[PDB]
């Protein structure tokens, strides 16, 4: 099921898969793989990232080959997260919807809801999303910066 | 009485579940206890802060 990808995908999807792929034979692990999924111009949720390994890695042994990597990226094209959709979702941690999220409410929802981050990763998200300052999460410019893959 | 009724209206903005004008954060016992304490203390001492914070 390495066919749902396009050649434009498959090329860089090797090139970044190759960044942990040994001697050109087409094989890496799954954590290096989750690292690889993320910089392919794509944005895999870890839930889909693991449900994908479930079907490609039939036994979940943790080793994935390159036709198997084309297999994973095949379904990643189906659940590709888009531009306006995350702009909309950021308005939800903002409970009153004032336009941006507060200081550590972001630190509390992303560390206990969804595919949870960490306080250090929340500070990293503050440097990336909270461009307004320390505690006013600007998701419009955040979408602008990540859509610039 | 003006601030009494203002805060009474504000209370239902936090004691009843009705978004976006309210949200169910508290419990009924906490509402009653806070109302009891504030009505007992602050408005009895209203003239105190009136003499200090009002020109």
């Amino acid at each position: 099921m390495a066919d749902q990808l396009t050649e434009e995908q498959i090329a860089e999807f090797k090139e970044a898969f190759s960044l942990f792929d040994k001697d050109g034979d087409g094989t890496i692990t799954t954590k290096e793989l989750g690292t690889v999924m993320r910089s392919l111009g794509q944005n895999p949720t870890e839930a889909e990232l693991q449900d994908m390994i479930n079907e490609v890695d039939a036994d979940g042994n943790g080793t994935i080959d390159f036709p198997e990597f084309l297999t994973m990226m095949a379904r990643k094209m189906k659940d590709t997260d888009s531009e306006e959709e995350i702009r909309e979702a950021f308005r939800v941690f903002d409970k009153d919807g004032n336009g941006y999220i507060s200081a550590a409410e972001l630190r509390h929802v992303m560390t206990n809801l969804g595919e949870k981050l960490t306080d250090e990763e929340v500070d990293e998200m503050i440097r990336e999303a909270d461009i307004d300052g320390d505690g006013q999460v600007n998701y419009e410019e955040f979408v602008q910066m990540m859509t610039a893959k | 009485e003006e601030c009494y009724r203002y805060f009474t209206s504000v209370l239902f903005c936090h004691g009843i579940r009705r978004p976006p004008f309210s949200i169910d954060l508290f419990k009924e016992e906490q509402l009653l206890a806070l109302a009891d304490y504030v009505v007992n203390t602050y408005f009895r001492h209203f003239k105190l802060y009136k003499y200090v914070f009002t020109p």
Binding site: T45, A47, D81, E85, I86, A89, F90, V92, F93, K95, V109, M110, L113, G114, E115, K116 | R17, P19, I23, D24
Partner: peptide
């Protein structure tokens, strides 16, 4: 709370 509790979880999963 169906919007700012559980859709927060979905929003985080995606964001």
């Amino acid at each position: 709370v169906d919007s700012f509790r559980k859709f927060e979880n979905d929003a985080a999963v995606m964001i």
